[PDB]
C-alpha cells in the first residue's frame, strides 16, 4: 500500500592506510601467527529464545 | 474538600534490559562470575525448568 | 496528490576552517608533522601555486 | 620514515560486483576483494554505497 523499493547498484568502498613499508612488512608477518590472533566480543553476549 | 479517595502509587521503566550477573556478589563482575563460573558446574549438566 | 520530483541535496558547513595536515600519512601527529620537516621539505626553497 | 609511506598508494578502493541478483526479498553481492601487497584495513569502514 503505497511504497515500492528498487535499488540500482552496489559499490564497495573501504578506508585503507597508506602503509609505511619499513614497519608494515614486519607488521603483516606479526599478525601471521598462531599466537598473535585478536578476539572480539560484545558488551552483552546474550542468547535469544523467542 | 475531601472526596475520601486514595492515591495509587506506582513506577514505570522502559527501554532498559534488566541484567542479573550470575555472581553471589552481582556487582562489577561481568565475565568471570562467582556462582555460574565455578569449576563445579564444568563437571556435569543440569536442566532449568522455571 | 501524487506529483513527480527530483531532489537537490546540499551540505551546510560554517564557523570552522578547512583544515588539512602536512604529512605523507596526512594526519596531524604533534605540532610538526612528517612532511613539515622531512627529506624533501626541510631546507630547500619551493613556491606554492593553486 | 616509519608510519609514513613515501610511496603512492590508495586510501579508498572502489569495485562493483561482477554478478548482482534482484529477487523477492534478498539482494546478493559477490565480488573479489584484494588488499594491496603491504597494506592494512580495520573492518569498520568496508560498506556498500547503494
Amino acid at each position: 500500500d503505497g511504497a515500492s523499493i528498487k535499488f540500482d547498484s552496489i559499490c564497495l568502498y573501504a578506508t585503507f592506510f597508506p602503509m609505511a613499508h619499513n614497519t608494515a612488512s614486519t607488521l603483516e608477518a606479526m599478525l601471521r601467527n598462531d599466537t598473535n590472533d585478536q578476539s572480539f566480543n560484545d558488551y552483552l553476549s546474550a542468547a535469544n529464545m523467542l | 474538600t475531601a472526596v475520601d479517595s486514595i492515591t495509587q502509587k506506582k513506577f514505570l521503566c522502559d527501554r532498559t534490559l534488566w541484567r542479573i550477573p550470575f555472581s553471589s556478589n552481582f556487582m562489577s563482575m561481568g565475565a568471570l562470575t562467582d556462582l555460574g563460573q565455578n569449576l563445579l558446574y564444568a563437571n556435569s549438566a543440569h536442566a532449568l525448568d522455571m | 496528490t501524487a506529483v513527480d520530483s527530483i531532489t537537490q541535496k546540499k551540505f551546510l558547513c560554517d564557523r570552522t576552517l578547512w583544515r588539512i595536515p602536512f604529512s605523507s600519512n596526512f594526519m596531524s601527529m604533534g605540532a610538526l608533522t612528517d612532511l613539515g620537516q622531512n627529506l624533501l621539505y626541510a631546507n630547500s626553497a619551493h613556491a606554492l601555486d593553486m | 620514515h616509519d608510519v609514513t609511506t613515501d610511496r603512492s598508494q590508495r586510501l579508498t578502493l572502489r569495485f562493483i560486483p561482477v554478478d548482482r541478483e534482484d529477487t523477492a526479498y534478498s539482494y546478493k553481492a559477490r565480488f573479489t576483494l584484494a588488499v594491496g601487497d603491504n597494506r592494512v584495513l580495520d573492518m569498520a569502514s568496508t560498506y556498500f554505497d547503494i
Partner: peptide, 24 residues
C-alpha cells in the same frame, strides 16, 4: 619500535596503554 611514533620533547614515543573489556 622506538622509532615508529612522533614524540614530544626529543622522546620518540612516551606513555604505554590499556583498553577495557566489554562485560561489566
Amino acid at each position: 619500535f622506538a622509532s615508529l611514533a612522533p614524540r614530544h620533547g626529543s622522546r620518540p614515543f612516551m606513555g604505554n596503554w590499556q583498553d577495557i573489556g566489554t562485560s561489566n
